[PDB]
Design a binder for these strands. Structure first.
Lengths: 73, 653
RNA sequence: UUUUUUUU
């Protein structure tokens, strides 16, 4: 006996912080079946400059004049 | 007799104490002079005692010189009265003269016994290794006593023995944890040592002065051996002596000049061994070849300015440098000992007693700190040495010397990025050449852009071991008579050997084109041995397919030989820049290097006027007076650099 | 403008 209507769903249709406060490559050898080639992918991971340091760090690195005598000032 | 003369030697009277000393200890060090008899007589006494006995094991005597290993084994053939090859052998690089069951004591050289580790690490065949001449300190000797320190826990029955000089023998005992030093002080015909009282200005003149002081006044028959530094200061002293010998009067007796050094041809090196006749005096000029290698008869007087010439590998830029240094006190006392070879002899030293004590050094240089270590790291890593800094070696290589050899194995493909020796890297231990050279042979067979040319790369690689001592005199005079179209210093070597071969290996062909015939015998022996080991790996079989299945015999041959030598030698490429040629490395900058006067790229850039090729591959970056380059190879195309070694040159180009 | 000895 009143004015009532139904509105259903079928009818119609940056880092968060809590508080504010005040790298190196290492290769170790295997110690006692064969690899044909190094491959392109491998060099990309370990560059040629990096292999000389990293293998050591895995092991624990961290003109005389024309004529004179031996004196001859 | 011979049995009567063996009792005359100094080590024979010390023998009865010496046997109980060896039987009680394991490592024993003998401190003896030169000529004591510790080389010859010592392994004989073990056979007489029955050391080897019923057992299979045999004695090994290690010497650094290949020539000395054969010559001493002839003497033991005389003393034990058995023919050489049975019961007394020698095993050297080329002439194995042994019986596998009847030869007891074998006088092999130092590089041989390291190679037997590569197959059999524990040395199951030997009971008593005697290092000899351990004060030489060759590269093979330092690793050999470095590895035999680890083997002594694994075998308590192996005996080790060391013959050493006096001043070096103290440092050996501390290395083996204080093993006893035995002493045999046997010295023949002592020498009186004369000095200058004040330092000199120009030692070449005082050397020329002192010869005449011996020549005009002293007793005869007397010969003179002088020790100049290198080749170039012998010819300047040879020429200045020939003037003053003629200008002096007819009354003085004839003086003969006969220079010796390693690179001088064999026909003139035989002239010292000829006995000089009466009424004339022989003066010999020499480098270091006189003091240790060979024996000149009749040398009474020895003049010693006190200078040697040594090479220090600078491992950052990767260049050897060869400078003149004052020699150590150890090498001076070796120089004076060449005087007293026959009778009492004088030794004249062009320096003062104050400078000899306080300026000169005791030990010269350990050779492992000097030379390149790219070959032996692969020898160590294949013998299961995981830790190289902590490796119990006597004189440590510096860390940049040991770092550069680990990158250089990683570029070639021997070591995997995890550190494991790959399939290719196992082959480089087998071949009797460097790790760089054995990849040139490997891409000469297998690599898809460089196949089929292995029959020529064995020819060049054989020639490059002997490039100093090929040509008699100047190169271009002998280079032009052979052919006139060579643009690189490698293809000349392929062509000289191929035309020496089609002349059926004549002696008379070499003297036509001014090439040392003795050297070309040694190149042929190196070529045959590299050809055996390439059969045994199986490179010859994969070689011959790529010539039959792909026919290529045109001028594309010399473009595949160039691409094999890039894959072998990828750090050695320069680039043409504004000053000159500059080194193309990422770590080492441009060093402004200049082509050596011998090379074919030096004739074509000055005597003709070829425009310089933008890249040049070299074999050796050495600096005598200037940063030079030797054994050059023209790279015409820039894109061969990226395609052959992309692990370096995809970045730098 | 021109390499000291060597070893596999």
């Amino acid at each position: 006996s009143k004015f009532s209507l139904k509105l259903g769903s079928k009818t119609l249709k940056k880092i968060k912080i809590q508080s504010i406060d005040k790298k190196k490559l290492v290769i170790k050898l295997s110690e006692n079946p064969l690899v044909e080639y190094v491959t392109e992918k491998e060099y990309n991971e370990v560059p040629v400059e990096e292999f000389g340091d990293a293998l050591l760090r895995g092991m624990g690195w961290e003109i005389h004049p024309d004529g004179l005598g031996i004196g001859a000032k | 007799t011979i049995q009567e003369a063996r009792k005359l030697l100094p080590v024979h009277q010390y023998k009865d104490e010496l046997l109980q000393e060896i039987k009680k200890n394991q490592v024993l060090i003998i401190m003896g002079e030169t000529g004591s008899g510790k080389t010859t007589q010592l392994p004989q006494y073990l056979v007489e005692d029955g050391f080897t006995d019923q057992g299979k094991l045999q004695i090994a005597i290690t010497q650094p010189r290949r020539v000395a290993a054969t010559s001493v084994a002839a003497r033991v053939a005389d003393e034990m009265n058995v023919v050489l090859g049975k019961e007394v052998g020698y095993q050297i690089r080329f002439e194995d003269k042994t019986t596998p069951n009847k030869t007891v004591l074998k006088y092999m050289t130092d590089g041989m016994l390291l190679r037997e580790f590569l197959t059999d690490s524990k040395l199951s065949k030997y009971s008593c290794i005697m290092i000899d001449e351990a004060h030489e300190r060759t590269l093979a000797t330092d690793i050999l006593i470095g590895l035999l320190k680890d083997i002594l826990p694994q075998r308590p029955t192996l005996k080790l023995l060391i013959s050493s000089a006096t001043m070096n023998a103290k440092k050996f005992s501390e290395f083996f944890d204080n093993c006893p030093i035995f002493n045999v002080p046997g010295r023949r015909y002592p020498v009186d040592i004369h000095y200058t009282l004040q330092p000199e200005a120009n030692y070449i003149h005082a050397a020329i002065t002192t010869i005449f002081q011996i020549h005009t006044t002293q007793s005869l028959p007397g010969d003179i051996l002088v020790f100049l530094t290198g080749q170039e200061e012998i010819e300047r002293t040879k020429t200045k002596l020939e003037e003053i010998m003629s200008k002096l009067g007819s009354r003085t007796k004839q003086m003969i000049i006969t220079p010796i050094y390693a690179n001088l041809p064999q026909e003139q090196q035989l002239k010292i061994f000829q006995p000089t006749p009466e009424n004339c005096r022989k003066v010999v000029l020499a480098t270091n070849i006189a003091e240790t290698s060979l024996t000149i008869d009749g040398i009474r007087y020895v003049i010693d300015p006190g200078f040697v010439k040594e090479n220090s590998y600078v491992p950052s830029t990767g260049m050897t440098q060869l400078l003149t240094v004052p020699c150590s006190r150890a090498s001076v006392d070796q120089r004076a000992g060449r005087a007293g070879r026959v009778g009492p002899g004088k030794c004249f030293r062009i320096f003062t007693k104050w400078s000899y004590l306080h300026e000169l050094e005791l030990m010269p240089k350990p050779e492992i700190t000097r030379t390149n270590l790219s070959n032996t790291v692969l020898l160590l890593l294949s013998l299961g040495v995981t830790d190289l800094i902590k490796f119990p070696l006597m004189d440590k290589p510096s860390i940049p010397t040991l770092r550069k050899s680990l990158e250089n194995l990683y570029i070639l493909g021997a070591l995997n990025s995890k550190g494991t020796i790959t399939r290719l890297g196992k082959m480089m231990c087998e071949f009797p050449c460097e790790p760089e050279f054995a990849k040139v042979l490997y891409t000469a067979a297998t690599h898809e852009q460089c196949q089929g040319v292995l029959e020529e790369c064995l020819t060049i690689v054989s020639m490059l071991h002997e490039t100093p001592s090929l040509f008699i005199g100047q190169k271009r005079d002998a280079a032009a008579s052979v052919l006139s179209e060579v643009e690189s210093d490698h293809i000349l070597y392929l062509e000289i050997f191929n035309q020496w071969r089609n002349s059926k290996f004549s002696r008379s062909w070499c003297q036509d084109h001014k090439i040392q015939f003795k050297t070309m015998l040694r190149v042929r022996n190196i070529r045959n041995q590299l050809f055996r080991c390439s059969e045994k790996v199986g490179l010859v079989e994969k070689n011959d397919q790529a010539r039959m299945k792909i026919g290529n015999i045109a001028g594309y041959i010399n473009a595949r030989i160039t691409r094999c030598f890039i894959s072998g030698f990828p750090m050695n490429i320069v680039q043409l820049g504004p000053t000159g040629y500059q080194t193309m490395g990422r770590s080492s900058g441009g060093l402004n290097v200049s082509v050596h006067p011998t090379s074919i790229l030096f004739v074509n850039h000055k005597e003709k006027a070829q425009r310089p090729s933008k890249y040049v591959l070299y074999q050796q970056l050495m600096l005598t007076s200037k940063e030079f380059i030797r054994d050059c190879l023209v790279i015409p195309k820039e894109e061969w650099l990226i395609d052959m070694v992309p692990q370096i040159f995809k970045d730098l180009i």
